[PDB]
């Protein structure tokens, strides 16, 4: 794979340096593969990034009892993200089933900006 | 910045193609900056990735009342990640204050592998 990338780059532009270039290309490919893996796990919902607490009452929010999961179910992933004010009751919002991290980033960008 | 990277790459190895190479370098730099931004936000704790539910009783786990937050506090981030079995009580584990995403990745890798 690094050889193909080096050949493509040389074609576009047109002994230990070649080894260093191949190592750099391999590191970049590994980083891109890590990004793709994180995006794929985000798509499957295996990244449980917490949705932000809405500012107003929403159908999503509810008590922790809204977090019902099966008795037989042995999932390691938390079903909801909850906050318990010293001022009131436990408020829980379910984690998105897909694109939880991307949805959180969109919510955070919308709120901050 | 792309010009410096192109010069460094040419030095290591030693008109529209130059523009395409500069655009590719700029895209790679933007992607690396996005990675650095995500890592930085992970360090500050602004990414609320849920820790996995422990298999045994742990000091971390507790009811939603363990999720106490200040009455004056108006934080948009959920304090805990909770699951409510149909079989028992609401179990809540606090989100790590720092490196929540990295800690979740470590926990997920340890559990899966």
């Amino acid at each position, epitope marked *: 794979i690094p050889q193909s990338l080096d050949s493509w780059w040389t074609s576009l532009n047109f002994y230990r340096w070649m080894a260093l270039r191949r190592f750099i290309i391999f590191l970049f490919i590994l980083l891109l593969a890590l990004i793709f893996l994180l995006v794929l796990l985000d798509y499957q919902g295996m990244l449980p990034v917490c949705p932000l*607490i*809405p*500012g*107003s*009452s*929403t*159908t999503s*929010t*509810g*008590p*922790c*009892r*809204t977090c019902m999961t099966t008795a037989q179910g042995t999932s390691m992933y938390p079903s909801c993200c909850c*906050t*318990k*004010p*010293s*001022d*009131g*009751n*436990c*408020t829980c919002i379910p984690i998105p089933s897909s694109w939880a991290f991307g949805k959180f980033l969109w919510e955070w960008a919308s709120a901050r900006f | 910045i792309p010009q410096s990277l192109d010069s460094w790459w040419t030095s290591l190895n030693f008109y529209r193609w130059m523009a395409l190479r500069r655009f590719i370098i700029f895209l790679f730099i933007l992607l690396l900056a996005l990675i650095f931004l995500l890592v930085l936000l992970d360090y500050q704790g602004m990414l609320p990735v849920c820790p996995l539910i422990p298999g045994s009783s742990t000091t971390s786990t507790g009811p939603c009342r363990t999720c106490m*937050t*200040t*009455a*004056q506090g*108006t*934080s*948009m981030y959920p304090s805990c990640c909770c699951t409510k079995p149909s079989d028992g009580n609401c179990t809540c584990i606090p989100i790590p204050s720092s490196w929540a995403f990295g800690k979740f990745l470590w926990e997920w890798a340890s559990a899966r592998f």
Partner: antibody
Framework: QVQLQESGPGLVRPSETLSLTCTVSGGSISNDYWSWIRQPPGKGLEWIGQIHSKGDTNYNPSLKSRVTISVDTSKNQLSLKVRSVTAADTAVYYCARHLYRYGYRNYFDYWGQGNLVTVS | DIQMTQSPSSVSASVGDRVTIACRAS??????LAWYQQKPGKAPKLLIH???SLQSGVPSRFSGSESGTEFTLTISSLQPEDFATYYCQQANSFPLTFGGGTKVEF
């Protein structure tokens, strides 16, 4: 704007079940915590109990578990049943929606008009 | 049960006066106190929540201070529509309890 309106009798006989209803218009009775608070005539407010549509209900221990609160999401209704009332149950009852400020709060921002029930 | 005491039981004030109403919790409520205003024959109106956060639409002349366990509601200028009964609620623990009510008179 959420509009709470109480309904029910005002001549509940002693040693009888006190039934009250609170119809919520202009909104949804789900998604919020709703409490019943009673005020005896000339006395202070006394919180009877809260309930959420998707959760459990909390009651005042001073009522000795003779009070049941329910939610009818189909009718947007909030029902209160105070069993075995005495002359002390003569009071104005309010259904109150709980404040929500980045989480459910135990404060009552919207109140019903209040229905006076006399036990005699 | 958190006992919620109010002081005084009645305040004799005129228009344009600095009116103070004190509330005290039997045990610390972590600034989980609210102030409600109730007029004769009307439902209470939530004035302040969390002992310092003014309610939306409430005039800014109302203020809430939380010095220790002793909370205070302050009215800078007592308008003629401000003569009512003021209740303090604790929200930290269940059951939620109100104060005895401070009736601000003429």
């Amino acid at each position: 704007q959420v509009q709470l309106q109480e309904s029910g009798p005002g001549l509940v006989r002693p040693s009888e079940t006190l039934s009250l209803t609170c119809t919520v218009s202009g909104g949804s009775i789900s998604n919020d915590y709703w409490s019943w608070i009673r005020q005896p005539p000339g006395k202070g407010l006394e919180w009877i109990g809260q309930i959420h549509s998707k959760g459990d209900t909390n009651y005042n221990p001073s009522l000795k578990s003779r009070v049941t609160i329910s939610v009818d999401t189909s009718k947007n209704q909030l029902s209160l049943k105070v069993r075995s009332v005495t002359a002390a149950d003569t009071a104005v009852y309010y259904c109150a929606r709980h404040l929500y400020r980045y989480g459910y709060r135990n404060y009552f921002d919207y109140w019903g008009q209040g229905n006076l029930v006399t036990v005699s | 049960d958190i006992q919620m005491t109010q002081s005084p039981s009645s305040v004799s004030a005129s228009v344009g006066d600095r009116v103070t109403i004190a509330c005290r919790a039997s045990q610390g409520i972590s600034s989980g106190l609210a102030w409600y205003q109730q007029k004769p024959g009307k439902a209470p109106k939530l004035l302040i929540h969390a002992a310092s956060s003014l309610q939306s639409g409430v005039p800014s002349r109302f203020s809430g201070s939380e010095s220790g366990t002793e909370f205070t509601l302050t009215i800078s200028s007592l308008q003629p529509e401000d003569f009512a009964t003021y209740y303090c609620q604790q929200a930290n623990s269940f059951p939620l309890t109100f104060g005895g009510g401070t009736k601000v008179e003429f």
